[PDB]
Enzyme design. Sequence first.
Site, PDB file in Angstrom:
ATOM      1  N   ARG A 164      28.457   9.099  14.425  1.00  0.00           N
ATOM      2  CA  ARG A 164      29.073   8.285  15.683  1.00  0.00           C
ATOM      3  C   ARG A 164      28.871   8.227  16.830  1.00  0.00           C
ATOM      4  O   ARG A 164      29.268   7.458  17.661  1.00  0.00           O
ATOM      5  CB  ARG A 164      30.670   8.384  15.195  1.00  0.00           C
ATOM      6  CG  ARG A 164      31.391   7.751  13.745  1.00  0.00           C
ATOM      7  CD  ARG A 164      32.595   8.198  13.817  1.00  0.00           C
ATOM      8  NE  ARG A 164      33.145   9.549  13.536  1.00  0.00           N
ATOM      9  CZ  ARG A 164      34.121  10.125  13.403  1.00  0.00           C
ATOM     10  NH1 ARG A 164      35.163   9.266  13.688  1.00  0.00           N
ATOM     11  NH2 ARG A 164      34.525  11.265  13.022  1.00  0.00           N
TER      12      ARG A 164
ATOM     13  N   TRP B   5      20.564   5.082   9.908  1.00  0.00           N
ATOM     14  CA  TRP B   5      19.488   5.872   9.495  1.00  0.00           C
ATOM     15  C   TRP B   5      19.753   6.976   8.703  1.00  0.00           C
ATOM     16  O   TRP B   5      21.156   7.601   8.990  1.00  0.00           O
ATOM     17  CB  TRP B   5      18.424   6.120  10.723  1.00  0.00           C
ATOM     18  CG  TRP B   5      18.933   6.824  11.694  1.00  0.00           C
ATOM     19  CD1 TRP B   5      19.091   8.062  12.065  1.00  0.00           C
ATOM     20  CD2 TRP B   5      19.104   6.316  13.194  1.00  0.00           C
ATOM     21  NE1 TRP B   5      19.691   8.278  13.214  1.00  0.00           N
ATOM     22  CE2 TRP B   5      19.739   7.195  13.938  1.00  0.00           C
ATOM     23  CE3 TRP B   5      19.033   4.800  13.731  1.00  0.00           C
ATOM     24  CZ2 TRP B   5      19.986   6.932  15.094  1.00  0.00           C
ATOM     25  CZ3 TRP B   5      19.607   4.622  15.092  1.00  0.00           C
ATOM     26  CH2 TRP B   5      19.977   5.708  15.826  1.00  0.00           C
TER      27      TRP B   5
HETATM   28  C1  HEM Z   1      22.899   5.860  13.262  1.00  0.00           C
HETATM   29  C2  HEM Z   1      22.945   6.354  11.841  1.00  0.00           C
HETATM   30  C3  HEM Z   1      23.656   6.994  11.061  1.00  0.00           C
HETATM   31  C4  HEM Z   1      23.800   8.372  10.763  1.00  0.00           C
HETATM   32  C5  HEM Z   1      22.844   9.507  11.007  1.00  0.00           C
HETATM   33  C6  HEM Z   1      24.981   8.591   9.761  1.00  0.00           C
HETATM   34  C7  HEM Z   1      25.187   9.659   9.035  1.00  0.00           C
HETATM   35  C8  HEM Z   1      26.106   9.597   8.082  1.00  0.00           C
HETATM   36  C9  HEM Z   1      26.129  10.461   6.995  1.00  0.00           C
HETATM   37  C10 HEM Z   1      25.214  11.754   6.665  1.00  0.00           C
HETATM   38  C11 HEM Z   1      27.117  10.112   6.007  1.00  0.00           C
HETATM   39  C12 HEM Z   1      27.699  10.608   4.838  1.00  0.00           C
HETATM   40  C13 HEM Z   1      27.018  10.272   3.872  1.00  0.00           C
HETATM   41  C14 HEM Z   1      27.343  10.857   2.401  1.00  0.00           C
HETATM   42  O1  HEM Z   1      27.554  11.989   2.250  1.00  0.00           O
HETATM   43  O2  HEM Z   1      27.415  10.024   1.373  1.00  0.00           O
HETATM   44  C15 HEM Z   1      27.888   8.846   6.955  1.00  0.00           C
HETATM   45  C16 HEM Z   1      29.031   8.349   6.327  1.00  0.00           C
HETATM   46  C17 HEM Z   1      29.616   7.303   6.987  1.00  0.00           C
HETATM   47  N1  HEM Z   1      28.833   6.616   7.910  1.00  0.00           N
HETATM   48 FE1  HEM Z   1      27.526   7.129   9.001  1.00  0.00          FE
HETATM   49  N2  HEM Z   1      25.656   7.380   9.822  1.00  0.00           N
HETATM   50  C18 HEM Z   1      24.949   6.455  10.701  1.00  0.00           C
HETATM   51  C19 HEM Z   1      25.460   5.095  10.738  1.00  0.00           C
HETATM   52  C20 HEM Z   1      26.582   4.367  10.377  1.00  0.00           C
HETATM   53  C21 HEM Z   1      26.829   2.999  10.793  1.00  0.00           C
HETATM   54  C22 HEM Z   1      25.836   2.166  11.126  1.00  0.00           C
HETATM   55  C23 HEM Z   1      28.017   3.023  10.062  1.00  0.00           C
HETATM   56  C24 HEM Z   1      28.786   1.871  10.153  1.00  0.00           C
HETATM   57  C25 HEM Z   1      28.526   0.865  11.101  1.00  0.00           C
HETATM   58  C26 HEM Z   1      28.106   4.104   9.502  1.00  0.00           C
HETATM   59  C27 HEM Z   1      29.699   4.477   8.731  1.00  0.00           C
HETATM   60  C28 HEM Z   1      30.016   5.553   8.143  1.00  0.00           C
HETATM   61  C29 HEM Z   1      30.863   5.632   7.068  1.00  0.00           C
HETATM   62  C30 HEM Z   1      32.304   4.347   6.694  1.00  0.00           C
HETATM   63  C31 HEM Z   1      30.869   6.605   6.174  1.00  0.00           C
HETATM   64  C32 HEM Z   1      31.413   7.157   5.098  1.00  0.00           C
HETATM   65  C33 HEM Z   1      30.624   6.238   3.773  1.00  0.00           C
HETATM   66  C34 HEM Z   1      31.556   7.042   2.517  1.00  0.00           C
HETATM   67  O3  HEM Z   1      32.588   7.219   2.646  1.00  0.00           O
HETATM   68  O4  HEM Z   1      30.805   6.934   1.312  1.00  0.00           O
HETATM   69  N3  HEM Z   1      27.322   5.333   9.782  1.00  0.00           N
HETATM   70  N4  HEM Z   1      27.085   8.712   8.018  1.00  0.00           N
HETATM   71  N1  LIG Z   2      23.098   7.627   6.861  1.00  0.00           N
HETATM   72  C1  LIG Z   2      23.941   6.839   6.248  1.00  0.00           C
HETATM   73  N2  LIG Z   2      24.211   7.333   4.976  1.00  0.00           N
HETATM   74  C2  LIG Z   2      25.202   6.634   4.094  1.00  0.00           C
HETATM   75  C3  LIG Z   2      24.472   6.124   2.753  1.00  0.00           C
HETATM   76  C4  LIG Z   2      23.763   7.121   2.037  1.00  0.00           C
HETATM   77  C5  LIG Z   2      24.349   8.014   1.325  1.00  0.00           C
HETATM   78  N3  LIG Z   2      23.826   9.202   1.254  1.00  0.00           N
HETATM   79  C6  LIG Z   2      24.807   7.632   0.076  1.00  0.00           C
HETATM   80  O1  LIG Z   2      24.086   7.788  -0.931  1.00  0.00           O
HETATM   81  N4  LIG Z   2      26.021   6.752  -0.269  1.00  0.00           N
HETATM   82  C7  LIG Z   2      26.683   6.181  -1.483  1.00  0.00           C
HETATM   83  C8  LIG Z   2      27.926   6.951  -1.547  1.00  0.00           C
HETATM   84  C9  LIG Z   2      28.155   8.341  -2.129  1.00  0.00           C
HETATM   85  N5  LIG Z   2      29.298   8.579  -2.707  1.00  0.00           N
HETATM   86  C10 LIG Z   2      26.583   4.839  -1.564  1.00  0.00           C
HETATM   87  N6  LIG Z   2      27.357   3.922  -1.217  1.00  0.00           N
HETATM   88  O2  LIG Z   2      25.436   4.129  -2.318  1.00  0.00           O
HETATM   89  N7  LIG Z   2      24.498   5.798   6.589  1.00  0.00           N
HETATM   90  N8  LIG Z   2      24.099   4.726   7.799  1.00  0.00           N
HETATM   91  O3  LIG Z   2      24.436   3.901   7.656  1.00  0.00           O
HETATM   92  O4  LIG Z   2      22.861   5.352   8.139  1.00  0.00           O
END
Ligand code: HEM
Ligand SMILES: N=C(NCCC[C@H](N)C(=O)N[C@@H](CCN)C(N)=O)N[N+](=O)[O-]
Lengths: 407, 410
Positions: free
Chosen positions: B111, B280
């Site tokens: 974030r 990413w």
């Molecule tokens: C800039 C790069 C970003 C990084 C390094 C990052 C990293 C992460 C990681 C490591 C997770 C956990 C994923 C998992 O374990 O399934 C996550 C979850 C999440 N991120 Fe980020 N994120 C990024 C960008 C974003 C963006 C662009 C958004 C929204 C506009 C976002 C929204 C969220 C949400 C809603 C979750 C939870 C998803 C779930 O509950 O399955 N992320 N993020």
């Molecule tokens: N880095 C991110 N990671 C979230 C997406 C990859 C994540 N490791 C993943 O496999 N998410 C599953 C949910 C896992 N329970 C999906 N929605 O396909 N998000 N991003 O916007 O940069």
Amino acid sequence: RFLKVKNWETDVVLTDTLHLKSTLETGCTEHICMGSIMLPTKDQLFPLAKEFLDQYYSSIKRFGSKAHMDRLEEVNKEIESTSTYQLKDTELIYGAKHAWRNASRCVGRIQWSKLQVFDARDCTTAHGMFNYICNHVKYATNKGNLRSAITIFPQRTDGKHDFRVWNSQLIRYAGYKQPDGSTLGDPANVQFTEICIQQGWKAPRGRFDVLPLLLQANGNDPELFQIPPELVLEVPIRHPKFDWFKDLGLKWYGLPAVSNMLLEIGGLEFSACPFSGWYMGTEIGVRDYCDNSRYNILEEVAKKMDLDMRKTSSLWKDQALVEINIAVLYSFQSDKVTIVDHHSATESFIKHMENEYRCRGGCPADWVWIVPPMSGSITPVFHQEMLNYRLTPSFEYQPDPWNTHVW
Amino acid sequence: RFLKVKNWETDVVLTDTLHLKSTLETGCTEHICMGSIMLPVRTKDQLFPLAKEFLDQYYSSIKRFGSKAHMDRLEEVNKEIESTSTYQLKDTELIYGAKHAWRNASRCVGRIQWSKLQVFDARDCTTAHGMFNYICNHVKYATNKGNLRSAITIFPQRTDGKHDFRVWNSQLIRYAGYKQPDGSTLGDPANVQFTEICIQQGWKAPRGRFDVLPLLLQANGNDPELFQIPPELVLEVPIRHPKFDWFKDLGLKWYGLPAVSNMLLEIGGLEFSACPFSGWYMGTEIGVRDYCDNSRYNILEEVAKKMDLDMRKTSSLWKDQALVEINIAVLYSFQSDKVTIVDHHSATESFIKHMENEYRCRGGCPADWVWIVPPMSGSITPVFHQEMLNYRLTPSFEYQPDPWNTHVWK
Ligand code: HEM
Ligand SMILES: N=C(NCCC[C@H](N)C(=O)N[C@@H](CCN)C(N)=O)N[N+](=O)[O-]
Ligand code: HEM
Ligand SMILES: N=C(NCCC[C@H](N)C(=O)N[C@@H](CCN)C(N)=O)N[N+](=O)[O-]
Ligand SMILES: C[C@H](O)[C@H](O)[C@H]1CNc2nc(N)[nH]c(=O)c2N1
Ligand SMILES: C[C@H](O)[C@H](O)[C@H]1CNc2nc(N)[nH]c(=O)c2N1
Ligand SMILES: [Zn+2]
């Protein structure tokens, strides 16, 4: 309501009903979760006693029996008269074993029923406490084949005659502040290491100096005592490949023995109740050795492994972490001292959870504490949903005595 | 009310006031914590207040709270709702809303980047082909030849619940999974059910270990349609190790653009059911979860064997040793191909700085510890030592049931 718990690796779902018997609060609300916060009268007493006796008699298949009713009345009259009561040896043992059974932050509860209880309620002095403690240490160490045990001193009366062990664990290493501004030994024990000196102890000013016990009996001022070195089993740490490892000059004690918690059974409070089992490898290798505020040794180990510490992304910290933890386990197993790796311990906990769910209808567990500080997701508990809630009998936190004692 | 949060490594204590504005429930009670539980058609009635709350936050963010522009917008929306039962967001409000749903995502460690989000307004889209075009444009923009740029594409909001736009894939880019008659799985086990639907819908599966899935797109409540993403648009990275020359021979590779596409975006009471977003990767997502989860590619053994580790007993920590190398490899491969990625040390450290900044300028930062702490080397990252408060603020990204379980086929 009846809650369900799913393991996202095996799909197994368990239903939880045990939580419906929860009494104490969690610290959370419908609005905010505090799941990661480290620490979120005669009239009052009888209810507590009744709740406890009821489960005790139920556990022995005598629920509602005359014995049950008689006991309930006897304790009832005792409280009304003495404003307190005394547990029968049987109830004491059942209580302690269950406080462990209910410890939501403990990953080794599969061992809960095999706890040796030492009744020290007849104790009256610090030397007496020292004697009881030495006997517990020797019993539990058992030359390396560790055995879980707890020693229960007299329960609280009017809070002005509380028994307390000032140490946080029966056995730990000293911590001293140096001119350098740096810290010698264990930083976590700096303050305690001072109150020992401020009381009389003669610190060797070493890196691994076994601290002296600071025992408090009946509200009196605590007294120092040195545990017979022959009773403190220690393990020199070496790697099964890096012969340079030993030069790090690292060692740890074999007996983990929390001594600052409060044991609550049927309303009664045991403020001095040291207990011990055996270590999970990571506690030492990951937390004691690698935490930045502890022995913080990653950089040294990293250097002797000669790996690029220039960039975080080379994961040198992670590589070193693994090696260090391989050493800890290796050393304990070599010196024949009991120790369990995070993989085996978590596997056991999952099995325990399943047992508890079917034979008790649940198992309070704190995921934040159950998941090992390293390789979280490759251990099974990581994928296991857990419900956390408080049940009594229980082990609770209590103020460090030096912040409450009136000398 | 004030709430204290402490870091047990630095003794730094922060104070949270932001939680006073949390409306949604958490799943926990004063008697039970559901902190580790993965997942514990509105009326004009409950819509205007939801709209008002949002617009007050919006106008306050732009320092125009109470202005004429602010009061008129409120009256304009109220009328529109009474009149049409819903309402349309201005582009500015849409962008502000999208950014905040990310800013409020308590399970997201990335974030610190919230304010830099490229929002693509796809509310004029009416068909699945239109959705495909929008998604192709998003993947190309976001990928940017490897120098990834955060973005989100927002399709038309929900109206009556029978005309939803939905992206059936869970991520825009993912590998197919195939269950064999012998019980084993070819490809990614996590995507087996979706892969089957794609086949049933007509996709000609190449049945390999890393087949990029076709997009299954649903527009205006109609039956979903298949589309293949132009291969030249799908950036992938072959996985090799800095020192283990045999690693490359494991035949591993991963896509570089993570893009969740099954979440619901809620802004001012309005529900956006198709809102693919991308940023990413944090290395551990691929190296620890996608590769080493037992129910995923599960390569720990094969990697352990090649390393000639002692696999006779767990205490050798062979799993832990293999894990680090694999993760070293994922990071190394991406950096070498110049595709953006971040390791868990850098990502968690940035999140702590972001979190502290948020407490001071915003009064808080809801965060889910269970999700924030990395799946490996937990305690050597600063977040492990950080107490966090989890609560729900809107706008937000929410889970929604998989469309194949609710869709009425035409
Ligand atoms: C800039 C790069 C970003 C990084 C390094 C990052 C990293 C992460 C990681 C490591 C997770 C956990 C994923 C998992 O374990 O399934 C996550 C979850 C999440 N991120 Fe980020 N994120 C990024 C960008 C974003 C963006 C662009 C958004 C929204 C506009 C976002 C929204 C969220 C949400 C809603 C979750 C939870 C998803 C779930 O509950 O399955 N992320 N993020
Ligand atoms: N880095 C991110 N990671 C979230 C997406 C990859 C994540 N490791 C993943 O496999 N998410 C599953 C949910 C896992 N329970 C999906 N929605 O396909 N998000 N991003 O916007 O940069
Ligand atoms: C015999 C095997 C045992 C193992 C492997 C084991 C393992 C663990 C571990 C790793 C922790 C977390 C320690 C920390 O992070 O500070 C823990 C916590 C705890 N264990 Fe066990 N334990 C065992 C025996 C005991 C016994 C004998 C009792 C009670 C009589 C018990 C009661 C607790 C409690 C109350 C906590 C939490 C203490 C705190 O909050 O600091 N454990 N245990
Ligand atoms: N394995 C145990 N671990 C609990 C005690 C060791 C733990 N790693 C520890 O250092 N606890 C601190 C408290 C940690 N905040 C203490 N009480 O000295 N317990 N046991 O009986 O087997
Ligand atoms: C802030 C957070 O609660 C804290 O760092 C917790 C996390 N999990 C833990 N888990 C165990 N077993 N032991 C600990 O000391 C901690 N510390
Ligand atoms: C049961 C438990 O909540 C579950 O396995 C969670 C734990 N933490 C996680 N953290 C992240 N980032 N992603 C996940 O999928 C999970 N899974
Ligand atoms: Zn909670």
